Design a protein around this ligand. Sequence first.
Ligand SMILES: [Cl-]
Ligand SMILES: [Cl-]
Ligand SMILES: [Cl-]
Length: 334
Amino acid sequence: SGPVPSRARVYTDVNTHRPREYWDYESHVVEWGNQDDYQLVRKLGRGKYSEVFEAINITNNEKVVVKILKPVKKKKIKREIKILENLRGGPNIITLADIVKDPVSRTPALVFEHVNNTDFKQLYQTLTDYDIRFYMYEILKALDYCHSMGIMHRDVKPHNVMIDHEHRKLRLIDWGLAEFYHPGQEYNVRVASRYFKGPELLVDYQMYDYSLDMWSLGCMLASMIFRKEPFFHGHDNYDQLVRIAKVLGTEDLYDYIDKYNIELDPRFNDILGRHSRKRWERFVHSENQHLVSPEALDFLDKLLRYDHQSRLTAREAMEHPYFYTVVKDQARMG
Ligand SMILES: [Cl-]
Ligand SMILES: [Cl-]
Ligand SMILES: [Cl-]
């Protein structure tokens, strides 16, 4: 009795083909910038999830966003900084600018590029079918890039997507749970907010990969097209799989449990029991029908699969018909 090993379908050994220092964050020596160069303007309010500030970098007068990280392990701080530096410049990924410690708290602070405060959460339930397609493809750009750079985000959810309303500039943020993918590495199942936890985390399948981000994105998509926030509404980690099972059916769940020989608690197995597969047309109602099309259902169907290996890659996702017209967007800004 033992869980079978798994491998990522794409970008499998990207980190291996790179030098050690690219992914060996525990050896990274953190370069510090001057605190006296940054002055905080106003508390930008991450909804009391974190300490986010507007700040002026006085040495160049430019505006910066400063986040003071809640006191975590030295290991996890090293990770994020190395991840952000490596990902710097990529499409729709927050640009890290400086690393500073606060003198009145001894707490590390991250400095980011110009950001206007609009959380995707309070927007994604009121947007056109076209703009759902537009921003989804923008997120994919970030995820395809960061996966190719050997990094799983591990907290894909609308609260961690920031959108500049007026410029339509989308930045994927919150890389505090992000981790370098290495073939054959066991990863923590504690990552990701429950509503966006993939089946792999929910069954304790520990050798998952980038394909985790794609499930979460499927949950985000499901939320937008059906106007159900959130789509899978688990009141419990166990109930989260129940809510999933009541939609995709239990059959394919037991294929997934069998395939990778995952040992699931026979008591949890009892509660899961037998649920039939539901077609998405049953989530369709008057309010959301205009936000739903066959290509939307097809894409989502190819994201919300139990078997992580059978979910679309970020690249395969960017080539789906669902985004066919939106790739030709004419960047109208009013
Ligand atoms: Cl962030
Ligand atoms: Cl692996
Ligand atoms: Cl990918």
